[PDB]
C-alpha cells in the first residue's frame, strides 16, 4: 500500500521503459549500501555498463532512493561515477551507470600495500570530487574504500550517493544518523547538527584503511566502535613509522574531533602531501588483474 504509493512516485521521476530491452547477460558483481550491482552488455554496441538494482521494500528509508536521481540529474564530474538512466523495474529501482571495471578500492586495501604516490593520487582524486560537491552543499556521508571505484587505467571515482544529503542557507546542517559505523564522524555519532566536515573525517578513516588495511576498531561490533569513536581521542595508525611526516601532517588535518577545526576539502587540495600524487597509471599495478 505505501509500497504501491512509493512505486508510483518513483515512476514520475525515473526514465520510462525497461532497460532489459537493450541489455543482455546481467551478471552480479557486488552488493553494497542499498542493493546489488550487476554488469550487463549493451546489445547494439557490445559495451559493458553497470546496473545498480535497489529493492524498494528493503530500504531503511525509501525516500533516500531519490538521491540516486538528484545526483544523476545534477552533479556529474570527472571523479564521480557517471549515471546514464534510471528506471522502475517491478519492485526495484535500477540505475544504468558507468562500469568501473578496475573495481573498488577495498579490494586493493585488503590485499596489498599502497605507497604514498598511490595514496596521494587517491586522496587528490577524492578531494577534487568532494570540493565540488561540498561547494554545492552536497554531503556524501558514506565515504569509505568501498565507495571509491576505479577504471582499468587507474582513474578514481566516487560512487554510492544513496545516503547523501544537501545543506544550504535554509537548512545549514543535517541531523540524520547515516553512514557505516567505523567511518562515521564523531559529531555525527554524538547526534550533533553536522555538515560536509563529516566526509573529511571519513576520508581520514579511509587513509587509515589505505595505510593499515582496515579502519580503526574493525574488530569491535559496530555499536561498540561508534561509542569508542564518540568518546576517544582521534584514532591512531597501527604504525606511525610507516607514514612520512607529510602524510602524518595530512592525516592530522582530517582526523580533528572539532569539526570547526577540521580542514575543508578546498584547504586540503593545497596540502603539500598531495604534491606526491602520481598519475592514474601509478594506481594500475595495484588492481587484482595486474598484481601477481
Amino acid at each position: 500500500v505505501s509500497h504501491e504509493q512509493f512505486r508510483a512516485a518513483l515512476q514520475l521521476v525515473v526514465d520510462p521503459g525497461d532497460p532489459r530491452s537493450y541489455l543482455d547477460n546481467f551478471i552480479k558483481i557486488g552488493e553494497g549500501s542499498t542493493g546489488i550491482v550487476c554488469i550487463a552488455t549493451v546489445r547494439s554496441s557490445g559495451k559493458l555498463v553497470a546496473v545498480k538494482k535497489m529493492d524498494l521494500r528493503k530500504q531503511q528509508r525509501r525516500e533516500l532512493l531519490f538521491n540516486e536521481v538528484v545526483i544523476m540529474r545534477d552533479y556529474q564530474h570527472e571523479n564521480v561515477v557517471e549515471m546514464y538512466n534510471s528506471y522502475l523495474v517491478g519492485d526495484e529501482l535500477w540505475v544504468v551507470m558507468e562500469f568501473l571495471e578496475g573495481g573498488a578500492l577495498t579490494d586493493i586495501v585488503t590485499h596489498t600495500r599502497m605507497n604514498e604516490e598511490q595514496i596521494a593520487a587517491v586522496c587528490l582524486a577524492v578531494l577534487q570530487a568532494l570540493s565540488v560537491l561540498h561547494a554545492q552543499g552536497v554531503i556524501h556521508r558514506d565515504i569509505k574504500s568501498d565507495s571509491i571505484l576505479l577504471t582499468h587505467d587507474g582513474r578514481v571515482k566516487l560512487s554510492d550517493f544513496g545516503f547523501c544529503a544537501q545543506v544550504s542557507k535554509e537548512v545549514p546542517r543535517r541531523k540524520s544518523l547515516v553512514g557505516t559505523p567505523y567511518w562515521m564522524a564523531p559529531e555525527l555519532i554524538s547526534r550533533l547538527p553536522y555538515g560536509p566536515e563529516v566526509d573529511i573525517w571519513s576520508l581520514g578513516i579511509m587513509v587509515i584503511e589505505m595505510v593499515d588495511g582496515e579502519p580503526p576498531y574493525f574488530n569491535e561490533p559496530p555499536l561498540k566502535a561508534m561509542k569508542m569513536i564518540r568518546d576517544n581521542l582521534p584514532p591512531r595508525l597501527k604504525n606511525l613509522h610507516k607514514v612520512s611526516p607529510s602524510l602524518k601532517g595530512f592525516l592530522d588535518r582530517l582526523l580533528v574531533r572539532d569539526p570547526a577545526q577540521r580542514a575543508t576539502a578546498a584547504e586540503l587540495l593545497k596540502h603539500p602531501f598531495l604534491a606526491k600524487a602520481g598519475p592514474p597509471a601509478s594506481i594500475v599495478p595495484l588492481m587484482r588483474q595486474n598484481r601477481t
Binding site: 530500504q59 577495498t106 553512514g179 567505523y182
Partner: peptide, 6 residues
C-alpha cells in the same frame, strides 16, 4: 564488509 547503518 560491514553494512551501512541508516
Amino acid at each position: 564488509r560491514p553494512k551501512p547503518l541508516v
